[PDB]
Design an enzyme around this catalytic site. Structure first.
Site, mmCIF file in Angstrom:
data_model
loop_
_atom_site.group_PDB
_atom_site.id
_atom_site.type_symbol
_atom_site.label_atom_id
_atom_site.label_comp_id
_atom_site.label_asym_id
_atom_site.label_seq_id
_atom_site.Cartn_x
_atom_site.Cartn_y
_atom_site.Cartn_z
ATOM 1 N N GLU A 35 -12.660 19.512 -66.814
ATOM 2 C CA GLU A 35 -12.394 20.685 -66.234
ATOM 3 C C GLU A 35 -11.894 21.673 -67.738
ATOM 4 O O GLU A 35 -12.644 22.959 -67.584
ATOM 5 C CB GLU A 35 -10.758 20.644 -65.659
ATOM 6 C CG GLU A 35 -10.699 19.799 -64.275
ATOM 7 C CD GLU A 35 -11.831 20.084 -63.381
ATOM 8 O OE1 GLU A 35 -12.061 21.349 -63.154
ATOM 9 O OE2 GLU A 35 -12.375 19.352 -62.475
ATOM 10 N N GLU A 47 -20.934 18.152 -60.965
ATOM 11 C CA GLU A 47 -19.899 18.922 -59.748
ATOM 12 C C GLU A 47 -20.583 18.431 -58.213
ATOM 13 O O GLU A 47 -19.900 18.076 -57.271
ATOM 14 C CB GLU A 47 -19.706 20.236 -60.071
ATOM 15 C CG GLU A 47 -18.582 20.517 -60.852
ATOM 16 C CD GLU A 47 -18.760 22.055 -61.422
ATOM 17 O OE1 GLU A 47 -17.511 22.156 -62.278
ATOM 18 O OE2 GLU A 47 -19.351 22.813 -61.046
ATOM 19 N N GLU A 103 -11.371 26.681 -64.034
ATOM 20 C CA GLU A 103 -11.213 25.351 -64.909
ATOM 21 C C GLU A 103 -10.302 25.487 -65.556
ATOM 22 O O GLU A 103 -9.727 24.323 -65.858
ATOM 23 C CB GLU A 103 -12.740 25.333 -65.860
ATOM 24 C CG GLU A 103 -14.047 25.596 -65.005
ATOM 25 C CD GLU A 103 -14.097 24.448 -64.026
ATOM 26 O OE1 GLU A 103 -14.977 24.151 -63.341
ATOM 27 O OE2 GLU A 103 -13.291 23.780 -63.544
ATOM 28 N N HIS A 121 -17.729 26.871 -57.318
ATOM 29 C CA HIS A 121 -18.419 26.499 -58.587
ATOM 30 C C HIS A 121 -19.976 25.839 -57.965
ATOM 31 O O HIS A 121 -20.833 25.983 -58.774
ATOM 32 C CB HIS A 121 -17.939 25.544 -59.299
ATOM 33 C CG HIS A 121 -16.429 25.737 -59.621
ATOM 34 N ND1 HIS A 121 -15.582 24.755 -60.415
ATOM 35 C CD2 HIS A 121 -15.663 26.967 -59.456
ATOM 36 C CE1 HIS A 121 -14.526 25.634 -60.758
ATOM 37 N NE2 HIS A 121 -14.533 26.712 -60.139
ATOM 38 N N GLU A 140 -13.900 24.351 -55.182
ATOM 39 C CA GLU A 140 -15.254 23.696 -55.588
ATOM 40 C C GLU A 140 -16.573 24.607 -54.960
ATOM 41 O O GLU A 140 -17.472 24.716 -55.533
ATOM 42 C CB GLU A 140 -15.411 22.490 -55.029
ATOM 43 C CG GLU A 140 -15.899 21.559 -56.356
ATOM 44 C CD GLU A 140 -15.018 21.690 -57.555
ATOM 45 O OE1 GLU A 140 -15.390 21.508 -58.491
ATOM 46 O OE2 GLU A 140 -13.663 21.561 -57.355
ATOM 47 N N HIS A 176 -7.728 24.098 -63.195
ATOM 48 C CA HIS A 176 -7.964 22.583 -62.694
ATOM 49 C C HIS A 176 -7.403 21.912 -64.407
ATOM 50 O O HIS A 176 -7.049 20.760 -64.068
ATOM 51 C CB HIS A 176 -9.249 22.518 -62.696
ATOM 52 C CG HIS A 176 -9.790 23.101 -61.502
ATOM 53 N ND1 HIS A 176 -11.016 23.204 -61.288
ATOM 54 C CD2 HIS A 176 -9.148 23.723 -60.424
ATOM 55 C CE1 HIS A 176 -11.193 23.867 -60.031
ATOM 56 N NE2 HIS A 176 -10.158 24.178 -59.425
HETATM 57 FE FE LIG Z 1 -12.823 22.422 -61.838
HETATM 58 FE FE LIG Z 2 -15.492 22.743 -60.953
#
Ligand SMILES: [Fe+3]
Ligand SMILES: [Fe+3]
Ligand SMILES: Oc1ccc(Br)cc1
Ligand SMILES: Oc1ccc(Br)cc1
Ligand SMILES: [Fe+3]
Ligand SMILES: [Fe+3]
Lengths: 166, 388, 510, 388, 510
Positions: C97, C192, C127, C229, C226, C130
């Site tokens: 992350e 991912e 990120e 992303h 998510e 995270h």
């Molecule tokens: Fe992440």
């Molecule tokens: Fe991510």
């Protein structure tokens, strides 16, 4: 006496302490990078410490260059006296003129070994890095898999010592 | 079903019984403090430090690193993932920096979220309270929709100026702050636009489009110089530290503070405009927030580095001068805006008093920290040479 | 005078027009691709709205953690094996992350369209969240768990072991070093889309099975971020689909991206799941096949087919080398247990039956080895036996791939057994597969990562542990252990007495 | 011990299995919506409604109640715990009211808390930005300290006026709204003191004591009639609806709005004061939030009641007439403050226009809703007589 | 030019000066006391800071409810009996919280000192908070629990039964009807201090022991607010001590308040605890003795002795009538089970033992009664039997105390067996003790509450249940049940078979 603190590292700290000349230090750095960095280093005898050593040298060269250069020069002149913008534009030329990935490769690696800061100013360095790298990649990723491994090993010039595949 | 089909080890009798049987009579180590090996900047270690310091996997060959060895994968050419080569500044430890506000992601988005929610409530109150009635039509349609608006691209530019740093910063603590500094900047740019969007809903002919404010930025003469300074800080500098420093401890401190505070924050009222001020209040709160971090990194950490103090100050002094001129210039061109203000709006006695404030504050908070001896009179004089 | 306001979407409408043209308005990083300056982002978000939606999630998460979960003593009533497992899962993912922050920063600098930059920016901040979330998991288990060592200092103690090297490759360097687009594929297009997203949900599943309610509370919260992303990775491909260099370079960086990621996660994740738990959720082979083949290699890649994207040519090779990879890797992980920052356990009877049932032939190979080591006293400090000795005695060298850093043992493996050794300008290089070998051959300067044997060569084992702080509070007991019970923990002394000195295995070819 | 002494039914294997064994296979009723029987104001029942409506145990003999029978314990003499006798207004159902903002406790303190934390962030940025420097000293020490300071007692008096309604309101929805209208008033009074307290910290010699503002309130002329009106609304009114209605739909709607918006917010800016407007933005947001509630209760529910519409309007009209006079008197005396300002601050035309804005908004948002016949030029003319 | 701000205490220092003098500045409520004009408060709060500290508590509370607890299905995994207990516990408490809102509003009006007004003000808001919190528990159990009926409509189904009447006495009318100070004693000096504060904690214990993690999450949050309410009740005593009238009236109001609260909570709480749970925590008798005698009658009351406060003169009787009170009441509660909004259960074998052990003689009296009702088929819908019938057959009339509303059966109760029947101006009145009787004799007009027998007289049982919506969503199954099992639930029709008609027991007297 091992990973972070060892005799060989102490030895180099005393060797950089005796450096009191931008010229002498800028030289020892250039020579250090030729002896111990990149796949083309002259030997791997300092493989476990060169990264730490190289930086301890960059520090000495950085401090000096600052107390030896002037406003305008520290920003446009390498520690060797060269004119930053000159080299950058020059090296990019050779690269865009490079015949193949093998040629490009050498120019890029070479560019780093000689002009890595404190030698060249950061601003020009990374600018070339974005240009040099871009060309090196374009030539390399073109038909990446066509060349069989047997031949590739020959092109690289590696000495095969052992191979096993069931 | 009511109970579901998935059994969970914390509540399932069978499974929890087995788990409870495997547990030791007591914790296998009495040291329950994560980040216990970190050197506290304050009394006791803070949550902020525990959750942030050393998250970046730097090896010892990057001042402060705790790991060892080269990176596993590098750039074509050999350029390191992160390296001492991306900035002129040197230090004994890149993890020394500490955001005085101790901001990690959670507290950060919590504060901004409150502001967002209040902002909404405020706009709904302003519109319902008809406070727009006491607002000067000229100022509204010309100074807020054109000059204030166009200033958003200035902030946006300073925002983008943080992209390279977000990728190259040499430590977690520094990376988080940079990210926040840039994120607040785009927030402001989006707030400058939010207002024009609001005015659009309460003022019949008001056009929210950025066409007008953009042209003033792209081809205007009021900001022209300012824009050149932005483009330089953003796309001509490849050194993450130079970019952060020059932008926060030079440009925005001089030009930015003036344009926001010593102009709209000081004049918008005079035209029956409390709206715009509601937003500048945020931008200034943010500015003052970012400033404490900028100070702790470049001065407390780098400028006073137990090993490269003199070296860094030299480089920062160098950077100061390098960008002080384009900043002065940016100002000069801006002065040409006062001429567009109706007579009586303000005089040269004030403009001089304000400028000296921005400059004196600049010298008081940044300049004197790195010993960049500056002449308050010359600077003011130089910028002032831009009046009608 | 009706109550009025302005929302994100209304402000985002003009975001694209935020960026203006001019000479040096271009990315500062080397790339072979040209991202479109007209590219749009899926979510019309502004800084303030972003913060609000994330704040609302934090509130729930932290509220559960500080209140009900603490009152329930959720930090303790977790199976020992899983408490250890989370030391690695959370901290390893944390660095992923964390480098993602730099990656999306590099990506943000790449995009020329204002909206594309804005999208990446939203991830930059995600990120960061995270990084702090994964950090909070270790922080929490340290504060309230049955064993803090490791959870409390993983950021430094992880540097001792070899499994960490491979993690940096796929979740650190792979994320930021190289062509921005290549880094994107490693992060979003593969990592991912193929692993992390499905992974985080999987992790919460195994966690709940083993009594861990903390990780689900945090990871499920990460999961909600998510979808954004996924969009960035998809948009990265879109922004270069019209560029001529795409049809000439994309598929290559993608395959390389695929192999890089699967090379590590295929064996490591399966190992963490099956060997780091008591209660199982599902056989890793069934999971892998679903994730890699169907979902990703099929559905996900399929949708990008209209943009020139094709199935990684190294796919069939991956499935081949996959079956026994995680089983093969745990043998080495356990044999080198003193180099970790966590405690490992050997399969109990129920588990051996489970392994054999789902992997016919498992007992005759792995099963017998473990029972042999255990009977010899690998768990007991007074036996003087560390399984690495068994490898040496039976001439079963363990090598480290110069590229992926994954440990492999050709002479013992039940999976891949190919080995390629080369010498170039005074340095030996060991490779475990044809793909990694090519990458090194073509890009020698991109892969010079020193391995543990090279750095630890000549050093006596306990010296390395102590130097790198592999000890618990009492300055004597080892963080790492060969069992997860409360008694008979190994001490630095129990290791010193063995007098184990590291050797570089590649030198045997000299 | 690591596991503790107490065993919990949710996690303890033995106890949970006993729990699980006694559980039915599915819920004993599929209607899992608490408050399902409440008549929804909007499309679907809201969390605000479910958690609030009918919390008050009223019997059917108090319009809308669902219980039956007398109270269990009444006051000496016989007075009922709650009863129709506490207000002149009548309705078919006291539970019809709905706060349009649907504020139950959690949302209420959540928003106020955001405002609190942001306020603190704002002040720290205000002082760090040194904006106090450009504030006119006379406005600061005279008008903010004494006059704006004296207004806190006005808001405080209005807060107190809600004390009886908190005790007598005939429904939960009305009780909750009244409590919040009242709580927001004491908050404003406290924010006025907070500013004085803030100024005392960044301005040498500024005395935060309430002595001066209080003396201005208790014995000055500017607020004399205002105090007389507040003292009455608070202590001479025993009808909880007359109190709330007259405070919000008459006195605060005219006097309050004039003082906060047409004097302080309108003029503060002209004296380089962005501080006071920050707090006034809060006061006006609160005012607009309260108005929505005041309108729903008195106009939507009571003024438009299917059975008591005419009756209720007659009564509210009665109240408007009763409190309009003292309110005009309060505005009249307040006009005296204009003479105290530095020459050239504002003129008679501005004053008049601003009064018409306040009177016109009042007509549209309140007076017209119950058919009260208000002559705007007559109201203004009466007030203007107070100009010295 | 250094970053500066201002906090609550800095503003509070001047809050006492906010109030000013004027002829009509006086309380609008009747009272024998004069609250000291310069009384102060314990916590230096302002609206903004009050909101903040409460919001922070809400985040954790709702965070735990919406996330972890919901994921753990905590709303279901609770013992059936306890799911029913919480329908009464939470909704009944809700009204105490609610009436406390009005109660403190009345106190804030009584108080002349700005600080004492502000102390009460802070409680007014806490009481609204507590009303919404209690509603939330019923709300959550209705949405996620095993039986929503009752939880989803208690605000109207509570009106069917006799237990509700007593609740509105001690926690509704007792909080706002009478001398403001008297109301303060019932609410704060006695209510909270003697019963609710220790009660709230007790409930979380009983709840946790029966699998309920919802109530602890909410009630533990409520409890952190009670520090300020204790200071309020205490300052009420201090603000009147220096008044000549205080020596004349304080102890008399305190005694009546004590008896009022005790008369209802002694039997009701203990009943909810011991008969509304599967897993026991502590015998109600020892719990009571500690609360009422030790912690309150001695520790709490002793501290206020200096202000003229004395020990309650009816304390002896309260204790004498305590021991069996709750057992006496559950017999009536179960006998009249068709009039509730919850499901009740006969004590099981394991429980009867527990009861006998902790209350010798419990079996020979109650144990046998329940065993008989069981034999009569009180649990079975086809039996045509309802416990009430048993009281009629054995001439055991059930009366309702005109004052406390507490139902009682003098001829069967092991506790107080007293009964006083009076005729006054054409109406009959029945009392269960000398204190309640004095109250009515001296204050006839304060207690005219019509009882269920008076209102239901001549009405058939099923008609009353139907009229007041005592049914489940299917429109036929009764909300209340004589057992807590999942099948064989009585319907409205099973009660109409019965053909039971209410009659006023007092009509027998000539
Ligand atoms: Fe992440
Ligand atoms: Fe991510
Ligand atoms: O529980 C476990 C922790 C680490 C590894 Br590697 C495997 C299993
Ligand atoms: O569980 C129970 C619910 C209500 C009463 Br009354 C008793 C027990
Ligand atoms: Fe309460
Ligand atoms: Fe209370």
């Amino acid at each position: 006496l091992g990973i972070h603190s060892n005799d060989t590292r102490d030895a180099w700290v005393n060797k950089i302490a005796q450096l009191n000349t931008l010229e002498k230090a800028a030289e020892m750095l250039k020579q250090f990078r030729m002896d111990h960095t990149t796949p083309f280093r002259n030997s791997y005898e300092l493989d476990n410490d060169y990264l730490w050593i190289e930086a301890k040298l960059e520090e000495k060269v950085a401090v000096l260059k600052a107390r030896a250069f002037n406003e305008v020069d520290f920003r446009h002149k390498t520690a060797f006296g060269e004119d930053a913008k000159s080299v950058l534009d020059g090296t990019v030329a050779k690269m865009n003129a490079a015949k193949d990935k093998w040629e490009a490769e050498k120019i890029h690696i070479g560019f780093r070994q000689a002009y890595k800061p404190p030698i060249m100013p950061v601003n020009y360095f990374l600018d070339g890095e974005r240009q040099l790298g871009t060309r090196l990649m374009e030539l390399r990723n073109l038909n990446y898999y066509d060349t069989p491994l047997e031949e590739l090993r020959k092109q690289r010039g590696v000495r095969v010592v052992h191979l096993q595949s069931p | 079903s009511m109970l579901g089909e998935r059994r969970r080890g914390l509540t399932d009798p069978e499974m929890a019984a087995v788990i409870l049987k495997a547990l030791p009579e007591a914790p296998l180590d009495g040291n329950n403090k994560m980040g216990y090996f970190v050197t506290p900047r304050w009394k006791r270690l803070t949550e902020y430090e525990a959750l942030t310091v050393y998250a970046q996997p730097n090896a010892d060959w990057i001042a402060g690193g705790l790991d060892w060895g080269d990176w596993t994968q590098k750039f074509h050419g050999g350029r390191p993932s992160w390296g001492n080569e991306t900035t002129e500044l040197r230090t004994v430890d890149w993890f020394k920096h500490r955001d005085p506000l101790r901001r990690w992601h959670a507290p950060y988005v919590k504060d901004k979220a409150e502001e967002w929610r209040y902002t909404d409530r405020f706009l709904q109150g302003y519109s319902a309270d008809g406070q727009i009635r006491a607002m000067n039509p000229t100022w509204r349609d010309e100074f807020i929709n054109r000059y204030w608006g166009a200033f958003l691209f200035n902030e946006y530019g300073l925002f983008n100026a943080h992209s390279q740093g977000a990728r190259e910063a040499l430590s977690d603590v520094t990376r988080v702050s940079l990210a926040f500094w840039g994120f607040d900047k785009i927030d402001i740019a989006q707030m400058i636009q939010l207002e024009r969007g609001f005015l659009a809903k309460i003022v019949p002919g008001f056009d929210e489009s950025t066409a007008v404010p953009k042209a003033e930025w792209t081809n205007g003469e009021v900001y022209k110089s300012a824009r050149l300074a932005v483009e330089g800080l953003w796309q001509e500098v490849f050194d993450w530290n130079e970019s952060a420093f020059s932008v926060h401890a030079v440009y925005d401190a001089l030009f930015g503070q003036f344009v926001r505070r010593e102009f709209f924050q000081r004049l918008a009222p005079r035209f029956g405009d409390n709206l715009t001020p509601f937003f500048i209040n945020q931008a200034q709160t943010y500015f003052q927030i970012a400033k404490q971090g900028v100070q702790d990194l470049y001065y407390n950490c780098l400028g006073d580095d137990p090993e490269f103090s003199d070296y860094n100050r030299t480089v920062m002094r160098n950077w100061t001068g390098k960008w002080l001129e384009p900043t002065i210039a940016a100002l000069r061109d801006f002065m040409g805006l006062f001429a567009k203000l109706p007579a009586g709006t303000t005089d040269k006695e004030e403009i001089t008093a304000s400028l000296y404030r921005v400059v004196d504050d600049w010298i008081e908070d940044y300049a004197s920290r790195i010993d960049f001896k500056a002449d308050r009179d010359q600077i003011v004089k130089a910028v002032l040479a831009g009046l009608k | 005078r009706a109550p009025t306001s302005v929302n994100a979407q209304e402000v985002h409408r003009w975001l694209q027009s935020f960026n203006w043209d001019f000479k040096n308005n271009r990315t500062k990083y080397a790339t072979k691709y040209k991202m479109a300056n007209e590219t749009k982002e899926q979510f019309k978000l502004i800084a303030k709205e972003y913060a609000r939606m994330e704040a609302v999630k934090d509130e729930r998460q932290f509220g559960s953690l500080q209140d009900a979960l603490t009152r329930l003593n959720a930090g303790v009533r977790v199976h020992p094996k899983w408490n250890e497992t989370m030391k690695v899962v959370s901290n390893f993912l944390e660095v992923g992350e964390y480098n993602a922050i730099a990656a999306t920063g590099m990506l943000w600098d790449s995009a020329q369209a204002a909206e594309q930059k804005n999208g990446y920016l939203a991830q930059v901040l995600d990120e960061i969240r995270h990084t702090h979330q994964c950090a909070y998991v270790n922080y929490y288990f340290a504060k309230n768990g049955q064993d803090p060592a490791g959870h409390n200092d993983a950021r430094r103690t992880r540097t001792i072991g070899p499994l960490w090297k491979g993690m940096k490759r796929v979740f650190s360097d792979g994320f930021i070093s190289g062509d921005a687009v290549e880094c994107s594929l490693n992060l979003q297009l593969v990592g991912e889309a193929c692993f992390t997203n499905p992974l985080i949900v999987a992790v919460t599943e195994w966690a709940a099975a083993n009594g861990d309610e903390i990780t689900p509370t945090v990871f499920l919260s990460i999961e909600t971020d998510e979808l954004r992303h996924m969009a960035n990775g998809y948009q990265t491909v879109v922004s270069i689909a019209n560029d001529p260099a795409s049809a000439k370079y994309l598929n290559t960086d993608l395959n390389n991206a695929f192999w890089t990621q699967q090379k590590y996660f295929t064996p490591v994740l399966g190992m963490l799941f099956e060997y780091g738990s008591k209660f199982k959720v599902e056989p890793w082979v069934k999971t892998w096949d679903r994730w890699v083949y169907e979902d990703w290699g099929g559905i996900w890649i399929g949708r990008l087919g209209k943009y020139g994207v094709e199935s990684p040519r190294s796919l069939k090779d991956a499935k081949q080398d996959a079956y026994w990879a995680h089983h093969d890797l745990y043998l080495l992980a356990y044999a080198l247990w003193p180099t970790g920052f966590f405690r490992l356990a050997l399969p109990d009877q129920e588990e051996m039956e489970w392994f054999e049932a789902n992997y016919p032939g498992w007992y005759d190979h792995y099963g017998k080895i473990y029972e042999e080591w255990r009977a010899r006293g690998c768990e007991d400090p007074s036996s003087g036996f560390i399984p690495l000795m068994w490898f040496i005695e039976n001439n079963h060298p363990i090598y480290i791939d110069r590229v992926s850093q994954v440990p492999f043992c050709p002479s013992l493996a039940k999976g891949a057994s190919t080995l390629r050794v080369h010498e170039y300008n005074g340095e030996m290089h060991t490779f475990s597969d044809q793909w990694g070998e090519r990458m090194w051959l073509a890009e020698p300067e991109r892969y010079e990562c020193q391995n543990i044997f090279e750095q630890y060569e000549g050093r006596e084992l306990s010296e390395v542990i102590a130097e790198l702080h592999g000890l618990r509070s009492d300055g004597k007991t080892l963080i790492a252990q060969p069992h997860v019970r409360g008694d008979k923990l190994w001490t630095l002394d129990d290791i010193k007495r063995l007098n184990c000195v590291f050797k570089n295995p590649v030198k045997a070819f000299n």
